Amino acid sequence: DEQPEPRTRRRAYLWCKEFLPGAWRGLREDEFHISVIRGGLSNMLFQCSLPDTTATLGDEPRKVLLRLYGEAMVLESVMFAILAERSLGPKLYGIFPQGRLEQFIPSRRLDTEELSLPDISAEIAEKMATFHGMKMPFNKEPKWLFGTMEKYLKEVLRIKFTEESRIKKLHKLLSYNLPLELENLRSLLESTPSPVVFCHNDCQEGNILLLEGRENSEKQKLMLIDFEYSSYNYRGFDIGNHFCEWMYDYSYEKYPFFRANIRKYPTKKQQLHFISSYLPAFQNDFENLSTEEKSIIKEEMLLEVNRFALASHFLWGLWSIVQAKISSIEFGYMDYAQARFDAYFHQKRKLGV
């Protein structure tokens, strides 16, 4: 049990005491329990709980998660509150300028290897389809994807690195002519139909909870979390981006702190399994269509998601170059950027585009 700094213990006690009902309201400071889940400079996480010897008075939680930040603020808070109301995310117990109190969900995150398990993959698809089907009070013009890529590309072309290895690696990445490549990708995707839906935009193992005590259950053992990058976007991006994440393991404990394997991208068989679960969850009379109409829809979706996978590589590659310059957290960002652009051209070669 890693203990927080004294100032954080006191602040956490006050937020719990004032925002949570029942036994919390009368809790003494010397009875308050708190431990660090993740520290750092931003998005710090703590578990806060009542003493085992304190009974609950009503329906109040015995344990909660405190998230510290360390208008995007408004949109994020409204999104979280709405997903909570709809039973699609952890409940929201308290909101304040410095952070929030959320329902504690006993669980662990998935590992990269688990993404390919057929039952896990089927559930991710069903969960993503459920999120895609819902209405949210946000801008419905799908400007996010190329808007973000253009903004990031402009930043990348203004970066002045001082460190030798980053200078060299940047020269190589820019040698591809990224403006031209971006507008060729824009052209390709302009001609690729894909419905605009509420997308997670970051569906990978770190953002998927395996619910404790349900590990052996057939269905409903996962929860998608961490929707902070969500927006209306092309459905093909959310699915394609997820598929790309099959290739990257971020648990590697030595530099560059990730492993990449092109061979771990889902095979067409595995892609079909995923979309066969997605479709009936997104369009509820889907199974009643003829085997042949279902087959055509699946074929057209395979093309769509694999083209949109190219934008996942391009977007994350640009993001990673910017991180190499601006981040305060250690990671092989330039090497990761190169891995994404290698995958981009590999995928392009395979697609013949």
Ligand X SMILES: CN(C)c1cc[n+](Cc2ccccc2)cc1
Q: Does 40 count as an annotated binding residue? A: yes
Nearer to ligand X, 132 or 325 (CB): 325
Among 15, 93, 144, 152, binds ligand G8S (CB under 6 A): 152
Query: 23, 36, 92, 210: which one contacts its own copies (CB under 8 A)?
Result: 92
Residues ≥6 apart with Cβ < 8 Å to 97: none
Helix 118-132 and helix 235-245, axial crossing angle in degrees, nearest 10: 150
Give the one entry of ligand X, ligand G8S, its own copies, none that residue 94 binds, where binding means its C-beta sits below a cut-off of 5 to 8 angstroms depending on kind. Answer: its own copies
Both tokens of residue 285? 């009379």
315's enclosing H/E stretch is helix 291-326
Q: Residues 93, 104, 314, 319: which binds ligand G8S (CB under 6 A)? A: 319
> Residue 175 is encoded by which pair of tokens?
């040698």
Q: Would you count residue 333 as binding ligand X (CB under 6 A)? A: yes
Distance of CA 258 to the CA centre of its chain: 17
Query: From its own copies, ligand G8S, ligand X, none, which one binds at residue 336 (CB under 5 to 8 Å depending on kind)?
Result: ligand G8S
Asked whether position 102 contacts ligand G8S by CB under 6 A, the answer is no
Instruction: Determine, following the binding rule CB under 6 A, whether residue 98 of this chain makes contact with ligand X.
Output: no
The answer to whether 45 touches 37, Cβ cutoff 8 Å, is yes
List 52, 330, 349, 352, residue binding ligand X (CB under 6 A): 330
**Burial environment of residue 162 by CB neighbours within 10 A (0 to 12, 13 to 18, 19 or more):** exposed
Closest listed residue to residue 249, CA positions, set 308, 303, 205, 199:
205
Task: Give the position of tokens 């057209």.
Answer: 300
Binder to ligand G8S among 102, 123, 126, 202 (CB under 6 A)?
A: 202
| H or E, element range at 239 | helix 235-245
Indicate whether 336 belongs to the interface with ligand G8S (CB under 6 A).
Answer: yes
| Interface positions with its own copies (CB under 8 A) | 18-21, 25, 71, 73-75, 77-78, 81-82, 85-86, 92-97, 100-101, 135, 137-141
